[PDB]
Amino acid sequence: TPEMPVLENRAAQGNITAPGGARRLTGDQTAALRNSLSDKPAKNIILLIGDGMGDSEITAARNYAEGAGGFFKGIDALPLTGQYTHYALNKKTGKPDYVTDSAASATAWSTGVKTYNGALGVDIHEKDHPTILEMAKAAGLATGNVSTAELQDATPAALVAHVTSRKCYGPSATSQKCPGNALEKGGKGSITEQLLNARADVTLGGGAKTFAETATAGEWQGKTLREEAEARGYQLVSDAASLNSVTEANQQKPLLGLFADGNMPVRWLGPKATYHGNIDKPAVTCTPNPQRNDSVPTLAQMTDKAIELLSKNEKGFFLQVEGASIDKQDHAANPCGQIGETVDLDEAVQRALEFAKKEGNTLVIVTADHAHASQIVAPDTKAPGLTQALNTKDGAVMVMSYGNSEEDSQEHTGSQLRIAAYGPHAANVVGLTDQTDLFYTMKAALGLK
Amino acid sequence: TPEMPVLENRAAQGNITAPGGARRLTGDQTAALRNSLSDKPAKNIILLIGDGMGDSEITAARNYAEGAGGFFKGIDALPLTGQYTHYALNKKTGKPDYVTDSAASATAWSTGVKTYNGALGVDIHEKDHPTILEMAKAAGLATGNVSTAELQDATPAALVAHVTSRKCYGPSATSQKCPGNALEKGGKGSITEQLLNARADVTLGGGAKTFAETATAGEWQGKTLREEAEARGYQLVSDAASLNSVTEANQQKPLLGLFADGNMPVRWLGPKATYHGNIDKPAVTCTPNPQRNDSVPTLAQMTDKAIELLSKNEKGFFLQVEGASIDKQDHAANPCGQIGETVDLDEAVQRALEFAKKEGNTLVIVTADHAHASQIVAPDTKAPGLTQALNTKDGAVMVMSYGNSEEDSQEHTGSQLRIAAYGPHAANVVGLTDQTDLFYTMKAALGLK
Ligand SMILES: [Mg+2]
Ligand SMILES: [Mg+2]
Ligand SMILES: [Zn+2]
Ligand SMILES: [Zn+2]
Ligand SMILES: [Zn+2]
Ligand SMILES: [Zn+2]
16 A cells, blocks of 8 residues: 655644644654665656756745744655756866856756756757756657746756757757757757747747748748747647636647746735835735736646656656746845745645656656855845845744845855755665756666666 | 764765765665664763854855865764754743853753753753763763863853853852742852862863952851862863873863863864955965963863773763863854864764774764854845855855844844764764763763662
8 A cells, every 4th residue: 555655744732832842754764765765666757847946045035924943845855855066167168167047957857967058958068968858859859948937048958959059049049059950051950949849748938029020931931939839730829718628638739828028927016125125114915916817827737737748658758857947036026026936936836746646657747946145144134235124824924135246136156055866766866966967867767778 | 793884974075066076975775874873881972062063064065175175083983873852941931942141051961951041050940950961970981171262151061060040150150040949048159159069080171360359158158269279179270281291080080171261262264254245355265273271271282181081980981071162163153263163073983983993882972062153055145144264174155144134243043953973872863862962972872870
């Protein structure tokens, strides 16, 4: 009557003020850990990435949304945890670059090779290396690529595209920045063109804008990328209703969902942190974003439809799910935007876990590309950076600080960070590992090669 | 019987520029993990604490001393890992206070009750709670308390004292700061007097200064703390020569080593970080402190002796080792000092792991009280705080940034952080747990009733 348990409840068990009340455990965990260890092969894999979602980000989001002694039913629920490194390389020297971007990190987990900041699917010598999606596909597995960002963004693009710079979104930018990759130059194509060739079964996100560009060469020269996708038999959907109307997605009729021109709308609204924000302004309470929609699918919905479609495959499936805007809102120094996308991702993880639990042969991994700027500090802190006071679920104030940049955007940080997993082969995330180890873990799990 | 392994080598496997070159794993971990899970009783527990050592501090030290792709033979070797929370409580409201001090967090793990910032061994109503060392002693176990800080400091003090404020070092301050704890007003005494009453087998650290104080009352009034110590039978030692000469350590001959007036000397020196210091000044290489001596025992030496004296006890032991100055040097915004003390701890952890691996019935836990300010950022970073560039073991540049305060000292942060363990009951550290579970976990392991 086996089955691998998920963490059902790790909230504070009683009165936070009393002896034993703040305890998240209720008894010895040994037995439960043992039950969590299997080396059986995995049929499927669900990789959920919170971009910029390091330990700090998780904590701030839990404190705010669930209270300090709360528990994220999705994020905190994975039983096997570790900490991994995500350094990148200096292109010229080949030595470590301690603070990676999304492009180099995404490449790392999806290819198993370290690269330079800005590179997608290539190494420091600019050699193309096959990705876990292409490999899964090659072996006959269904494949999914879902994200809240523009599909040309680095995170999802890493799986289907090989370009020297993350910026070559479409023909236009490619010609000018990735001369080596430009179609009209003998190259493989811009990110959007490779994504279309890649042909995963299910791809959903934003970035409808770039599809308005036309190809400078080949069979579809002069037609728009959107027209191209139609001409090659993709099913195009652009709202919740039409998405939910899809019945099957495969190699004959691959799904392509374009839910916004750029990035998909953020779940919550609030003002930006500000200088001495926590002393000069009252505490903030985030509010749902009215532009979020009933016509716009949530991450959990996209995730849910994808598992549905992909699960038809007898052989199994690979699916990557990105909660994109945790990072984008961290850059913007917007606590509410940031937290709100963490809560969003947790909902997506709950869905993956519900599936995995009942299916029994699925590995579900939750992690991030790199760490980010936000820090939880004392309410009376006086910082030279940006700050904001928030009213949390506990009814107490929490102060959030962004102090690693004097200009435009807050930056990434190089701290090692959480990786949690559940299912067959989950054990490979425990202890210290490298981002590149995840590639090999997934490969091995899926039994590829 | 397949008795439990420590991670052997989690360094990058080969050439980090090549496929699979940065991998830390040489194969599937499932079997090894199974071998690591044991719910047999623990005979001994060694708890190592890096004050302010969040994942961030560990990463920087790693990059620095061992390279991005290196491995800490001590710190990174514990196979069972998780993340834990350490929020404190608001004294008046009892709602969470997101950022803890060393007093409140130390109280959490040593008594299993949350408390307010500044409290030592009391709850928000100011009532006492038995500490883990007190419970071990009651059971007839040998007990040790080692710090590189002054013994009065919060981390080591939380084990032996119950005062309303951490400032109540000795006679003088207590009278004025913790009236209800003052001896003259019938309290249990200042921290130092309370430490004396506690009578741990082995106590080593700095903090001699306060031992120069004269008691205001009791059977040793007018006499100094040091004189009282001698009168009570403690064996004093104030240098390394005399420490090694010690052969016995028990209840009627407790060891008390006072190796400094205040805190023991830090291993490494370097300039403090400065405004735009990564842009404005050359990269730094840390210098070994020439004033650290062959006369002053290192943490690993302190730990080594402690383990030896204590192990003579047939009943088992409880030992707490603190690498104190990580925190203090973080506050000071001194990368070299911060990193040097993490390297120091790592050395003490190795000593602990060595013993444990051989003995087979010892739980070893490595963690921190709370997170801190330091972040690793990109080399070209223009930040509003204090920054510095360092020359790592890789021959590359790493920049650390301090930007959560404009005031005197960098501040603590409330991010959840790594806890890692080896041995019997180590499984209770995996996943999400609270700083309060630690108490309960060590108490159940030793089967303290
Ligand atoms: Mg991203
Ligand atoms: Mg301390
Ligand atoms: Zn990112
Ligand atoms: Zn980013
Ligand atoms: Zn501390
Ligand atoms: Zn501190």
